Amino acid sequence: GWIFGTTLDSKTQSLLIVNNVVIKVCEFQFCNDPFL
């Protein structure tokens, strides 16, 4: 997947898409190098 935002993590609004395939627009604890 990918995380498309303009304020890094847990800031303003960060869009992401996760492959079922899940799409949501939420900023939260991305941490460093997330995993599935």
Side-chain angles (χ1 to χ4, degrees):
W2 311 263
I3 296 81
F4 306 97
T6 188
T7 52
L8 193 58
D9 315 346
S10 305
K11 211 295 182 59
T12 310
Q13 299 167 347
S14 64
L15 169 63
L16 61 83
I17 298 94
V18 176
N19 288 2
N20 293 114
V21 294
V22 186
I23 308 194
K24 71 209 287 185
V25 57
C26 314
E27 78 288 23
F28 49 90
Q29 288 76 15
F30 291 145
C31 312
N32 181 294
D33 283 331
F35 191 65
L36 278 158

Coordinates of all heavy atoms in Angstrom, one line a residue:
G1 N 0.8 -1.2 0.0 CA 0.0 0.0 0.0 C 0.8 1.3 0.0 O 2.1 1.2 -0.1
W2 N 0.2 2.4 0.2 CA 0.8 3.7 0.2 C 0.2 4.6 1.2 O -1.0 4.4 1.6 CB 0.8 4.4 -1.2 CG 1.2 3.5 -2.3 CD1 2.5 3.4 -2.9 CD2 0.4 2.5 -3.1 NE1 2.5 2.5 -3.9 CE2 1.2 1.9 -4.0 CE3 -0.9 2.1 -3.0 CZ2 0.8 0.9 -4.9 CZ3 -1.4 1.2 -3.8 CH2 -0.6 0.6 -4.8
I3 N 0.9 5.7 1.5 CA 0.2 6.7 2.5 C 0.5 8.1 1.8 O 1.6 8.6 1.9 CB 0.8 6.6 3.9 CG1 0.5 5.3 4.6 CG2 0.4 7.8 4.7 CD1 1.4 4.1 4.2
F4 N -0.5 8.7 1.2 CA -0.4 10.0 0.6 C -0.9 11.1 1.5 O -2.1 11.2 1.6 CB -1.1 10.0 -0.8 CG -0.7 8.9 -1.7 CD1 -1.5 7.8 -1.8 CD2 0.4 9.0 -2.5 CE1 -1.2 6.7 -2.6 CE2 0.7 7.9 -3.4 CZ -0.1 6.8 -3.4
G5 N 0.0 11.9 2.0 CA -0.4 13.1 2.9 C 0.5 14.3 2.6 O 1.3 14.2 1.7
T6 N 0.3 15.4 3.4 CA 1.1 16.6 3.3 C 1.7 17.0 4.6 O 2.5 18.0 4.7 CB 0.3 17.7 2.7 OG1 1.2 18.8 2.4 CG2 -0.8 18.2 3.6
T7 N 1.4 16.2 5.7 CA 1.9 16.6 7.0 C 2.5 15.4 7.7 O 2.2 15.2 8.9 CB 0.7 17.2 7.9 OG1 -0.4 16.3 7.8 CG2 0.3 18.6 7.4
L8 N 3.2 14.5 7.0 CA 3.9 13.3 7.6 C 2.8 12.4 8.3 O 1.9 12.0 7.6 CB 4.9 13.8 8.6 CG 5.9 12.8 9.0 CD1 6.7 12.2 7.9 CD2 6.9 13.4 10.0
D9 N 3.0 12.2 9.6 CA 2.1 11.2 10.3 C 1.3 12.0 11.4 O 1.8 13.0 12.0 CB 3.0 10.1 10.9 CG 4.0 9.5 10.0 OD1 3.9 9.8 8.8 OD2 4.9 8.8 10.5
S10 N 0.2 11.4 11.8 CA -0.6 12.0 12.9 C -0.7 13.5 12.8 O -0.4 14.2 13.8 CB -0.1 11.5 14.2 OG -0.1 10.1 14.3
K11 N -0.9 14.1 11.6 CA -1.0 15.6 11.5 C -2.0 15.9 10.3 O -2.0 15.2 9.3 CB 0.4 16.1 11.2 CG 0.7 17.5 11.7 CD -0.1 18.6 11.0 CE 0.2 20.0 11.5 NZ 1.6 20.3 11.3
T12 N -2.8 17.0 10.5 CA -3.7 17.4 9.5 C -4.5 16.1 8.9 O -5.1 15.5 9.7 CB -3.0 18.2 8.3 OG1 -2.3 19.2 9.0 CG2 -4.0 18.8 7.4
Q13 N -4.4 15.9 7.6 CA -5.1 14.7 7.0 C -4.1 13.9 6.2 O -3.5 14.5 5.3 CB -6.2 15.2 6.2 CG -7.3 16.0 7.0 CD -8.3 16.7 6.1 OE1 -8.0 16.8 4.9 NE2 -9.3 17.2 6.7
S14 N -3.9 12.6 6.5 CA -3.0 11.8 5.6 C -3.8 10.7 4.9 O -4.4 9.8 5.7 CB -1.9 11.2 6.5 OG -2.5 10.3 7.5
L15 N -3.8 10.7 3.6 CA -4.6 9.7 2.8 C -3.8 8.4 2.7 O -2.5 8.5 2.7 CB -4.9 10.2 1.5 CG -5.5 9.2 0.5 CD1 -6.8 8.6 1.0 CD2 -5.7 9.8 -0.9
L16 N -4.4 7.2 2.7 CA -3.7 6.0 2.5 C -4.6 5.0 1.9 O -5.8 5.0 2.0 CB -3.1 5.5 3.9 CG -4.1 5.1 5.0 CD1 -4.6 3.7 4.9 CD2 -3.3 5.3 6.3
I17 N -4.0 4.0 1.2 CA -4.6 2.9 0.5 C -3.9 1.6 0.9 O -2.7 1.5 0.8 CB -4.7 3.1 -1.0 CG1 -5.4 4.3 -1.4 CG2 -5.3 1.8 -1.6 CD1 -4.6 5.5 -1.6
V18 N -4.7 0.6 1.4 CA -4.1 -0.6 1.9 C -4.8 -1.8 1.1 O -6.0 -1.8 1.1 CB -4.3 -0.8 3.4 CG1 -3.8 -2.2 3.8 CG2 -3.6 0.3 4.1
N19 N -4.0 -2.6 0.5 CA -4.5 -3.8 -0.2 C -4.5 -5.0 0.7 O -3.9 -5.0 1.7 CB -3.7 -4.0 -1.5 CG -4.0 -3.0 -2.6 OD1 -4.8 -2.1 -2.3 ND2 -3.4 -3.2 -3.7
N20 N -9.3 -8.2 -0.3 CA -9.9 -6.9 -0.3 C -8.9 -5.8 -0.4 O -7.8 -5.9 0.0 CB -10.9 -6.7 0.8 CG -12.1 -7.7 0.8 OD1 -12.2 -8.6 1.6 ND2 -12.9 -7.6 -0.2
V21 N -9.4 -4.6 -0.8 CA -8.6 -3.4 -0.8 C -9.3 -2.3 0.0 O -10.5 -2.2 -0.1 CB -8.3 -2.9 -2.2 CG1 -7.5 -3.9 -3.0 CG2 -9.6 -2.7 -3.0
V22 N -8.6 -1.7 0.9 CA -9.2 -0.7 1.9 C -8.6 0.7 1.6 O -7.4 0.8 1.5 CB -8.9 -1.2 3.3 CG1 -9.6 -0.2 4.3 CG2 -9.3 -2.6 3.5
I23 N -9.5 1.6 1.5 CA -9.1 3.0 1.3 C -9.7 3.9 2.4 O -10.9 3.7 2.7 CB -9.5 3.6 -0.1 CG1 -9.0 2.7 -1.2 CG2 -9.0 5.0 -0.3 CD1 -9.1 3.3 -2.6
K24 N -8.9 4.7 3.1 CA -9.4 5.6 4.1 C -8.5 6.8 4.2 O -7.4 6.8 3.8 CB -9.5 4.9 5.5 CG -8.1 4.6 6.1 CD -8.1 3.4 7.0 CE -8.8 3.6 8.3 NZ -8.7 2.4 9.2
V25 N -9.1 7.9 4.7 CA -8.4 9.1 4.9 C -8.3 9.4 6.4 O -9.2 10.0 7.0 CB -9.0 10.3 4.1 CG1 -10.5 10.5 4.5 CG2 -8.2 11.6 4.3
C26 N -7.2 8.9 7.0 CA -7.1 9.1 8.5 C -5.6 9.2 8.8 O -4.7 8.5 8.2 CB -7.6 7.8 9.2 SG -9.3 7.3 8.7
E27 N -5.3 10.2 9.7 CA -3.9 10.3 10.2 C -3.8 9.7 11.6 O -4.7 10.0 12.4 CB -3.5 11.8 10.2 CG -4.1 12.7 11.4 CD -5.6 12.9 11.3 OE1 -6.3 12.2 10.6 OE2 -6.0 13.9 11.9
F28 N -2.8 8.9 11.8 CA -2.7 8.2 13.0 C -1.3 7.7 13.2 O -0.4 8.1 12.4 CB -3.7 7.0 13.1 CG -3.7 6.2 11.9 CD1 -2.9 5.1 11.8 CD2 -4.6 6.5 10.9 CE1 -3.0 4.2 10.7 CE2 -4.6 5.6 9.7 CZ -3.8 4.5 9.7
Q29 N -1.0 6.8 14.1 CA 0.3 6.3 14.5 C 0.9 5.5 13.4 O 0.9 4.3 13.4 CB 0.2 5.6 15.8 CG 0.0 6.4 17.1 CD -1.5 6.8 17.2 OE1 -2.4 6.2 16.5 NE2 -1.8 7.8 18.0
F30 N 1.5 6.2 12.4 CA 2.2 5.5 11.4 C 3.5 4.9 11.9 O 4.0 3.9 11.4 CB 2.5 6.5 10.2 CG 1.3 7.0 9.4 CD1 1.2 8.3 9.0 CD2 0.3 6.1 9.2 CE1 0.1 8.7 8.2 CE2 -0.8 6.5 8.5 CZ -0.9 7.8 8.0
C31 N 4.1 5.5 12.9 CA 5.4 5.1 13.5 C 6.5 5.2 12.4 O 6.6 6.2 11.8 CB 5.2 3.7 14.2 SG 3.7 3.6 15.2
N32 N 7.2 4.1 12.2 CA 8.3 4.1 11.2 C 8.2 2.8 10.4 O 8.2 1.7 11.1 CB 9.7 4.4 11.7 CG 10.8 4.4 10.6 OD1 11.0 3.4 10.0 ND2 11.4 5.5 10.4
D33 N 8.1 2.8 9.1 CA 8.0 1.7 8.3 C 6.9 0.7 8.7 O 7.2 -0.3 9.3 CB 9.3 0.9 8.2 CG 10.3 1.6 7.3 OD1 9.9 2.3 6.3 OD2 11.5 1.5 7.5
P34 N 5.6 1.1 8.6 CA 4.5 0.2 9.0 C 4.6 -1.1 8.2 O 5.3 -1.3 7.2 CB 3.3 1.0 8.6 CG 3.7 2.4 8.6 CD 5.1 2.4 8.1
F35 N 3.8 -2.1 8.7 CA 3.9 -3.5 8.2 C 2.4 -4.0 8.1 O 1.5 -3.5 8.8 CB 4.7 -4.4 9.1 CG 5.0 -5.7 8.5 CD1 5.8 -5.8 7.3 CD2 4.6 -6.9 9.1 CE1 6.1 -7.1 6.8 CE2 4.8 -8.1 8.6 CZ 5.6 -8.2 7.4
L36 N 2.3 -5.0 7.3 CA 1.0 -5.7 7.1 C 1.0 -7.0 7.9 O 1.1 -7.0 9.1 CB 0.7 -5.9 5.6 CG 0.1 -4.8 4.9 CD1 0.3 -4.9 3.4 CD2 -1.4 -4.6 5.2

